[PDB]
Each structure stands twice: as C-alpha cells, then as structure tokens.
Amino acid sequence: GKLPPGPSPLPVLGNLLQMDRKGLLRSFLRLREKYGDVFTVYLGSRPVVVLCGTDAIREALVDQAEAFSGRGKIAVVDPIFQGYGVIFANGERWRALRRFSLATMRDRSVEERIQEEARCLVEELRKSKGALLDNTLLFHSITSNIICSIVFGKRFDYKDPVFLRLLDLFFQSFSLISSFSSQVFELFSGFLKYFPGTHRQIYRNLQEINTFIGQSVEKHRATLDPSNPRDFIDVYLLRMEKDKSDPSSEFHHQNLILTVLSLFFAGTETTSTTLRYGFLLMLKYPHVTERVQKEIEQVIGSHRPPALDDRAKMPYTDAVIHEIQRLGDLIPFGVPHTVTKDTQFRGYVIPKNTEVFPVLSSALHDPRYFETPNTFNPGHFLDANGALKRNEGFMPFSLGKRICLGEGIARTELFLFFTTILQNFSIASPVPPEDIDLTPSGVGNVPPSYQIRFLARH
Ligand code: HEM
Ligand SMILES: OC[C@H]1O[C@H](O[C@H]2[C@H](O)[C@@H](O)[C@H](OCCCCCC3CCCCC3)O[C@@H]2CO)[C@H](O)[C@@H](O)[C@@H]1O
Ligand SMILES: OC[C@H]1O[C@H](O[C@H]2[C@H](O)[C@@H](O)[C@H](OCCCCCC3CCCCC3)O[C@@H]2CO)[C@H](O)[C@@H](O)[C@@H]1O
Ligand SMILES: Fc1ccc([C@@H]2CCNC[C@H]2COc2ccc3c(c2)OCO3)cc1
C-alpha cells in the first residue's frame, strides 16, 4: 500500500512550486486536473490527501465514516484551540463533547428564538424606510444573537456598543483567517510563528473573546440554579459537578471556554455570509425573488410569521435556499480531517493521522449531479412535479460523523430569516441585475459588499 498520487515534493517546501498563487482551493483544483480525484499534496513537509467530487468524498466520509472521522488542525487557530472544544477535539474527547453539545442545543426552542430574532430584525429594517444600507452587520448580529441566546441565555440589541465592539473584533478574525497570509501560515507556521503577522492578531482577538466568555462563565456559576439551568453554560457546569470524581472526564474549564468559542467560531460567519450571498442573488434574479414571495403569500400569507413547519409546504423557496448554499460554496475546501487509523482507500493506503481535505466545492459544482453547475438554478433541486428533490452532490455541511453540528439550526436560520424578511420587504439596489457580479476568499468564499434597500410592503 501507499499514498495517492501527486506531485513529487521538495524537502522543506513540499509542493510549494506546484501550488497556484490564487490560493489553496485553486491549487487543489489544478492538481485534480493532473492527478485525479484522490491525490497527495505536501503542505510544507506534511502529506495531505485531497478528496474531489461527490463520489470520492462520499466513499470516504460516508462509506468509511469512522476511519475518516478525525479532525486536522488549522494552523492560525490551533494556538487558541490546542485540540480542545468540540471542533478541534479528537477521539474520546470529541465524542463526549459532540454528544453533549447535540443533546444540549436540541432542548423557548431554538426555532422560537429564531422567529423572535427575525421579528427584531424586521422591526429594525422598517426603521430604515428604504434607505440604502450594507446588510453585513445586521446579518452578523442576527446570527451571533442566535448563538448568544443558546450559550448565554440572552440576545443583544443591534446598537449595543459593547456587543458591537466584540462583534467587530470577532468578525475581523474571519477575514484574517481567510487571507492569503494565513494560507501561507497553514504551510509554514513552524517558521512564521516567530514573526509578526495575521496569526498574532487572530490570536489576540480570539483571546479577548475567551476573556469575555470566561467572565460570563463566572457570572453563571455565581447565579446558578441547579434545578433550572438557563443555557448551554449552565448545563455544562452541572456536568462538571456530576463528573467531579472522574479525573479522566473531559468536562473541565478549558473544554468549556473552547466549546463556547467553537459554537461562535463555526456558527456565525458561515450562516451570516450565506444570508448575504442569498440577498445578492435575489437582487441579481428578481424573477426568483418574485416567485419566492408568491409562494410565501400562498402558504403563509402576509399576517402570521413564518414557522419552520412552513418549509415542507414551500418546495420552491426550499430549493432556492439549497441553490444559494450550493453556489455560495462558503467552505470550499472543507475543514481538515485526519484518518483515525491506517486506511485503505481506492487502492491506496493512508497512514493513521494523515490529514485529509474534502473539497466540498468540487461536489457542489459536480456536473454529474447539477446540470448547470456554474449557474443559479433552483431546478437543480426540483422534480418534474415541482416537489423538492434530494441531490447527492449537495453537501455544504459536509457528511459523515463530523457533519456540521449546527446543520439543523443553520437551516432553520436560513429559512426563517429569508422568508421573514421577504414577507415584509421587497428589495432594490443601485446596481442593475445585469451588472451584479457574484464572484468572491477563499478558505471561505466571501461575496462582494453591496448596498440594498428593504422596501416595506403591505
Ligand atoms: C449555512 C451555515 C453553515 C454551514 C454551511 C456550515 C458548515 C460546516 C462545515 C462544512 C463543517 C465541517 C464538517 C467537517 O469536519 O467535515 C462544520 C462543522 C461544524 N459546524 Fe457548521 N456550518 C454552518 C453553520 C453552523 C452553525 C449555526 C453551527 C452551530 C450552531 C455550526 C457548528 C459547527 C460545529 C460545532 C462544527 C464542528 C463539528 C465537529 O467537528 O464534530 N455550524 N460546519
Ligand atoms: O460596565 C460594563 C457593563 O456592561 C455589562 O454588560 C455585560 C453583559 O451583561 C454580558 O452579557 C456581556 O457578555 C459578553 C459575552 C461575549 C459575547 C461574544 C460574542 C458576541 C457576538 C459575536 C460573537 C462573540 O458582557 C458585558 C460586559 O459589560 C452589564 O450590562 C453591566 O452590569 C456592566 O456594568
Ligand atoms: O478555571 C479556574 C476558575 O475557578 C473558578 O471557577 C470555577 C469554580 O471554582 C468551580 O467551582 C466551578 O465548578 C462548579 C460548577 C458547578 C458547581 C457544582 C455545584 C452543584 C451543587 C452543589 C455544589 C456544587 O467551575 C468554575 C469554572 O471557572 C473561578 O471562579 C474562576 O475565576 C477561575 O477561572
Ligand atoms: F469546523 C469548522 C472549522 C472552521 C470553520 C471556519 C469558520 C469561519 N469561516 C471559515 C471556516 C473554514 O475555515 C477553514 C477551512 C480550512 C482551512 C482553514 C480554515 O485554514 C486552512 O484550512 C468552520 C467550521
């Protein structure tokens, strides 16, 4: 057995010279062209196995789900997470935190917090009276507020300057994490960590968030009612007490800080940018947005708030959302995995702990599953009867055991925010549809910034 084929590497520099300067995603797509769907690339001196196309990614993450369930490190944030918290934990630590986190958030429901946030957002947008605005901040705020409501048992006002201060420096961290400079850090951190760069700024920002999280933990502990836990932090503190006699237990303070940080880290920016991309497509394609508001009117009407049960009756809107996520492609080369043991895969052997990237973009644009993969097309998700249809290339949340933990919540946000906004508002912008440019990144693709008006309807 051996590793999947790929370009021969240099000793310190790995496959530096066979990389493309546009970044990792582009580097991977060009190599795929030369080497096939499964290949090995050296990021500095680390071998990394790259998976492209729906079928190879499913063969790994679904057909050998356990083998492929390891988590690989992200150099720019590892000095913060250091293998703690739900995202970056491995083995028994991960299993315990993932089990605990799923059970905890799945119990005012999440749906209800979302409808309340959407109600707050609409009330805020109305105050605009159709003024031009950049919706970036509002979309960061609504999605952060869903996580806040789950973890801290509260939401924050849109104009709260302390919320906004922390929000700003938190979201600044995402742009930085996505930059070319950080991508270079992913390859050569062993050297570059000794010099100034984005990694110090990412570190400082996230540590400052950890400080605030730590203060809210103290405050929760001081006011705790063990009979009536308020939120994720309360429930976790009760688990710490329950496990206090087990010194092997994963429920300690560091896992708590870093699990809370993980939920904001994974659950805010992807959701927010999906919404922002969505509204950019809805300005580019008024006929779609018109059909979505027609379906809203038929199913929901103009008086009551959308509810999640509405989605089953709204295949067209559901299909529009699927297509926004697909074309959005917000995590285009996945989040690194590792194999948890020596692994046979398509006739190659992948040694234990080798890093693997599932290149979700190449599934999202797979021409086997999407007739017009580069064109916005809700028909990709609709059958001949206009009913929603599952699509095997649709894996924006990934697949298998590491599948997005927040998938259910994120989809509920997407549905209720898109539909609650479009129920109450129509949209316009200074840029005619024809000149709207959808090209982003890209460790995470970021849409252009744009101006929009929300025009209150009857
Ligand atoms: C449109 C919005 C979202 C998208 C497309 C998305 C996508 C992803 C992806 C691609 C992964 C990597 C899975 C893998 O390792 O292969 C992931 C992991 C994760 N996601 Fe999401 N996400 C979104 C929103 C959220 C939200 C709202 C939450 C929490 C409320 C969240 C929580 C997490 C967590 C905690 C992990 C680590 C899972 C693990 O390692 O077991 N995500 N998500
Ligand atoms: O002088 C400071 C005053 O502000 C306080 O507000 C608290 C709030 O009660 C408290 O809920 C808040 O917690 C901050 C949690 C950190 C949130 C970080 C996330 C925010 C959303 C985006 C992702 C990151 O911190 C504030 C710190 O001040 C209290 O309102 C006052 O009692 C206090 O006197
Ligand atoms: O990590 C060290 C921290 O120690 C204290 O906080 C601890 C507390 O010392 C520690 O008591 C607490 O664990 C208790 C959590 C739930 C208490 C269980 C109770 C159940 C009812 C019967 C009494 C016990 O965890 C906190 C997490 O920080 C300090 O308050 C913090 O400032 C300090 O950061
Ligand atoms: F589990 C999760 C981990 C990281 C996220 C990030 C959250 C913010 N927006 C970008 C998401 C992906 O970021 C990555 C992707 C691959 C990488 C990378 C960083 O550096 C080199 O290889 C989301 C969920």
Report the pocket of ligand 4 as residue ranges, CB < 6 Å. Answer: 74, 87, 174, 177, 186, 265-266, 269-270, 331, 333, 335-336, 443-444
Residue 87 burial class via C-beta count within 10 angstroms: exposed 0-12, middle 13-18, buried 19 and up? buried
Q: What stretches of 199-350 adopt beta strand conformation (E)?
A: 337-338, 343-345, 348-350
| 271 CB near ligand 1 (under 6 Å) | yes
Residue nearest atom 30 in ligand 2 by C-alpha distance: 162
Mutation pick for ligand 4 pocket among 268, 355, 443, 446 (CB with most ligand atoms within 8 Å): 443
- Resolution stated for this PDB structure, in Å: 2.1
Residues 6 or more apart whose Cβ sits within 8 Å of residue 429: 132, 283, 436, 450, 451, 452, 453
Angle at 374 between CA 371 and CA 375, to 5 degrees: 80
Length of the chain: 458
Residue nearest atom 14 in ligand 2 by C-alpha distance: 212
Atom of ligand 3 nearest to the CA of 214: 34
Atom of ligand 2 nearest to the CA of 156: 11
Helix (H, G, I), strand (E, B) or coil at 345: strand
| 223 CB near ligand 3 (under 6 Å) | no
CA of 11 to the centre of ligand 1 (A): 34
* Short-list 44, 61, 52, 60, CA closest to 5: 52
CA of 158 to the centre of ligand 4 (A): 26
Helix (H, G, I), strand (E, B) or coil at 39: strand
Helix (H, G, I), strand (E, B) or coil at 359: strand
Q: Where are the domains of the chain?
A: 1-458
CA of 213 to the centre of ligand 3 (A): 14
CA of 397 to the centre of ligand 4 (A): 12
> Are the CB atoms for 75 and 189 separated by under 8 Å?
yes
Q: What's phi and psi for 47, nearest 5 deg?
A: -70, 135
> Are the CB atoms for 40 and 48 separated by under 8 Å?
yes
| Nearest-ligand number for the alpha carbon of 324 | 1
| Nearest-ligand number for the alpha carbon of 156 | 2
Mutation pick for ligand 4 pocket among 97, 335, 337, 356 (CB with most ligand atoms within 8 Å): 335
| 266 CB near ligand 2 (under 6 Å) | no
d(CA 160, CA 124): 13
* Short-list 145, 150, 199, 182, CA closest to 167: 145
Atom of ligand 2 nearest to the CA of 145: 21
> Are the CB atoms for 445 and 128 separated by under 8 Å?
no
| 170 CB near ligand 2 (under 6 Å) | yes
Helix (H, G, I), strand (E, B) or coil at 452: strand
Atom of ligand 1 nearest to the CA of 414: 1
| DSSP letter (8 states) at residue 342 | -
**137's tokens:** 């901040």
Helix (H), strand (E) at residue 48: strand 46-52
CA of 305 to the centre of ligand 3 (A): 41
Residue nearest atom 10 in ligand 3 by C-alpha distance: 221
d(CA 305, CA 118): 9
d(CA 75, CA 186): 5
Mutation pick for ligand 3 pocket among 241, 242, 245, 252 (CB with most ligand atoms within 8 Å): 241
Helix (H), strand (E) at residue 230: none
* Short-list 396, 165, 172, CA closest to 277: 396
Four-CA torsion 52, 53, 57, 59, nearest 10 degrees: -120
The experimental technique used to determine this model is X-ray
Does the 1-458 domain belong in CATH 2.30.110.10?
no
Tell me how far CA of residue 113 lies from CA of 118, 149, 155, 235, in angstroms.
Answer: 9, 7, 9, 18
